[PDB]
């Protein structure tokens, strides 16, 4: 009886909130973002009997990453030379070589342009792929750049070769990060192996669709995550563990040519072509792909107990979703993937190698916006890149009769990063509390 208030200081307890986060840079980074801030030595401490909940669909920093990536791109591109004077009437028929149909923008086109002195005009020419050209009304020999009817076009600075450098985040003073480590977690619900860290591990700002690549891999068996408010989900994420390797190549040898716009800025394009002409392609080990699809199918049925399962290729929309889109080196790609999803199922390593044929177009739009078409400078010579994949993005039609179906999508750039930050939830510590005791001043 007769207990009295004791006021402890700095007791461990937290509540949810949202706050800005520091972004760390690698110790040997590119060289505001190039070489700072510093790189720490991370550590992870495991705990006992810690009770906590997570929600991968609500957590904060997913939104923040969207701002950071766009801010970085804006900083990188802002000072580079605009291409506005280049946008003028093109005159082309372009059948000067035995290979004209596949590209149709050939050397020997012509468009009046300003020379290095401001009151004289000159005639030039260069290559273009028809996927970046459109035809004006009437005379079928006149052409215009696709995005110039609506926006200005900016050119990547030739000395800039930005690539996916990993980034990891550190909470500011007063906040703490919780991680969870149970290997069967669905992405929403309680955890029983809570943990705390100095900072998150590496994350790469990779841009792709129909599947995410160069990313990390799972720790256990394949997992499937989704929202659970209603079956009519937007995007279902499937996370792989077994890495299926992939290769892609571009055999032709591109020749770099240039023009100068005054006062002091140069413009690049594609000129002569060397070697025999072929379409770009990729390869896959059908063994591994079919085995992975088998496992996915036999895991996917858990939410759909008894219906048949069948895949079909994507449908409609701009090329950013009809195909697989990814970039290697300094140029982009688009790859039709009908063959890799025409399968089916029902209830109850180089053999058979598959190939797929792709295309490359220069002019690009940041997947979301209008008004900011990026222009890529062509890369001379041949290009090839090994790569591997770790997950797929699936959306579903209207389930009918005794069958259910999935198809590949994922055009919203948000989801990609949603697939690599399901772990962390950021909270704030409340270092003050109260309790009763019996101690006496004894003054």
């Amino acid at each position: 009886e007769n207990l009295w208030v004791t006021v402890y200081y700095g007791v461990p307890v937290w509540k949810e909130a949202k706050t800005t986060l520091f972004c760390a840079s690698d110790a040997k980074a590119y060289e505001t973002h190039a070489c700072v801030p510093t790189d720490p030595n991370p550590q992870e401490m495991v705990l006992k009997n810690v009770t906590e909940n997570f929600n991968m669909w609500k957590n904060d920093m997913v939104d923040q990453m969207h701002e950071d990536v766009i801010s970085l791109w804006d900083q990188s591109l802002k000072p580079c030379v605009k291409l506005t004077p280049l946008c003028v009437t093109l005159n082309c028929t372009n059948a000067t070589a035995s290979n004209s149909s596949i590209i149709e923008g050939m050397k020997n086109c012509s468009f009046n342009i300003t020379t290095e002195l401001r009151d004289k005009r000159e005639k030039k020419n260069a290559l273009f792929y028809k996927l970046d050209i459109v035809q004006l009304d009437g005379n079928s020999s006149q052409y215009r750049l696709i995005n110039c009817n609506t926006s200005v076009i900016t050119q990547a600075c030739p000395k800039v070769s930005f690539d996916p450098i990993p980034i990891h985040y550190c909470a500011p003073a007063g906040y703490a990060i919780l991680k969870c480590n149970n290997k069967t977690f669905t992405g929403t619900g309680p955890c029983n192996n809570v943990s705390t860290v100095q900072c998150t591990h590496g994350i790469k700002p990779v841009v792709s669709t129909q599947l995410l690549l160069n990313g990390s891999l799972a720790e256990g068996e394949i997992i499937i995550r989704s929202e659970n408010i209603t079956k009519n989900v937007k995007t279902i994420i499937v996370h792989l563990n077994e890495s299926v390797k992939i290769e892609c190549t571009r055999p032709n040898n591109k020749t770099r040519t240039s023009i100068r716009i005054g006062p002091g800025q140069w413009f690049y394009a594609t000129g002569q072509v060397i070697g025999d002409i072929r379409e770009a392609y990729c390869n896959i080990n059908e063994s591994k792909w079919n085995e992975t699809l088998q496992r996915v199918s036999k895991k996917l049925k858990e939410y759909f107990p008894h219906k048949n399962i069948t895949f079909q290729p994507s449908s409609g929309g701009d090329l950013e979703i009809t195909t697989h889109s990814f970039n290697c080196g300094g140029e982009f790609f688009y790859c039709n993937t009908s063959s890799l999803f025409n399968r089916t199922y029902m209830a109850n390593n180089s053999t058979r190698t598959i190939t797929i044929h792709c295309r490359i177009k220069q002019i690009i739009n940041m997947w979301q916006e209008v008004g900011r078409a990026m222009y890529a400078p062509p890369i001379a010579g041949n290009i090839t890149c090994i790569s591997n994949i770790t997950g797929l993005l699936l959306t579903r039609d209207y389930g009918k009769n005794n069958t259910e179906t999935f198809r590949p999508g994922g055009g919203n750039m948000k989801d990609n990063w949603r697939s690599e930050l399901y772990k962390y939830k950021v909270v704030k510590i409340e270092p003050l509390g109260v309790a009763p005791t019996r101690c006496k001043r004894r003054v």
Epitope: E320, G409, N412
Partner: antibody
């Protein structure tokens, strides 16, 4: 404050292709879906399919995947619907509707539009 | 798949009365339901979504609740301009609609 207005429609001849259209207003064009719903006279509604403006994905109803068509342009905030081989039984009203949505689920319809009829006769 | 059975096809009332609508479902759809307003040659509008929460600009006399496999809508104090057709809607599996019930003059 936000509106969805329609143009086109009117009478059409049997067995002919037909068009409709909806024009967005300044709320935001990239942050919401769009649906097309119709109503035969003296009948319960039904749904056709939903088109996202962001990338252009369609997803048709199960009963009409051979005959419908969607596409959009973000530049002028416009959406076009193509319907082919009008049967006699398609005579009805058509609406556009916005559709609130979170990052991972779809909920309901909250702002219907102008309403446009179509009549088929030889 | 999902079907909503709307009954009765008509309700009779007079101004100042309290009228209750009802909507039945083929199978459970959680709390995912909403009620809509529709008038002669006009643009329908939102009344209630999530079966409990009212939206902005709505009159304060609307109310309703869920019943597991049934849904209830009620007008606390009927006004003259409230005489119209209403229909229930669900959004759990794939979109569908009811047939529509009309308010009627009591006699």
């Amino acid at each position: 404050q936000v509106r969805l207005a329609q143009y086109g429609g009117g009478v059409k001849r049997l067995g002919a292709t037909m068009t409709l259209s909806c024009v967005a207003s300044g709320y935001t064009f990239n942050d919401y879906y769009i649906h097309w719903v119709r109503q035969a006279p003296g009948q319960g509604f039904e749904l056709l399919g939903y088109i996202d403006p962001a990338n252009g994905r369609p997803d048709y109803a199960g009963a009409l995947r051979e005959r419908l068509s969607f596409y959009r342009d973000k530049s002028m905030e416009t959406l076009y619907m193509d319907l082919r081989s009008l049967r006699y039984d398609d005579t009805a009203m058509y609406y556009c509707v916005r559709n609130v949505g979170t990052a991972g689920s779809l909920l309901h319809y909250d702002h219907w539009g102008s309403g446009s009829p179509v009549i088929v006769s030889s | 798949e999902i079907v909503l059975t709307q009954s009765p096809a008509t309700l009779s009332a007079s101004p100042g009365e309290r009228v209750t609508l009802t909507c039945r479902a083929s199978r459970s759809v959680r709390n995912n339901v909403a009620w809509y307003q529709h008038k002669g040659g006009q643009s329908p509008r939102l009344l209630i979504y999530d079966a409990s929460t009212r939206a902005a600009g709505v009159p304060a006399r609307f109310s309703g609740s869920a019943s597991g496999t049934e849904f209830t809508l009620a007008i606390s104090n009927l006004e003259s301009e409230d005489f119209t057709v209403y229909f229930c809607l669900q959004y759990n599996n794939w979109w569908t609609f009811g047939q529509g019930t009309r308010v009627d003059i009591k006699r």
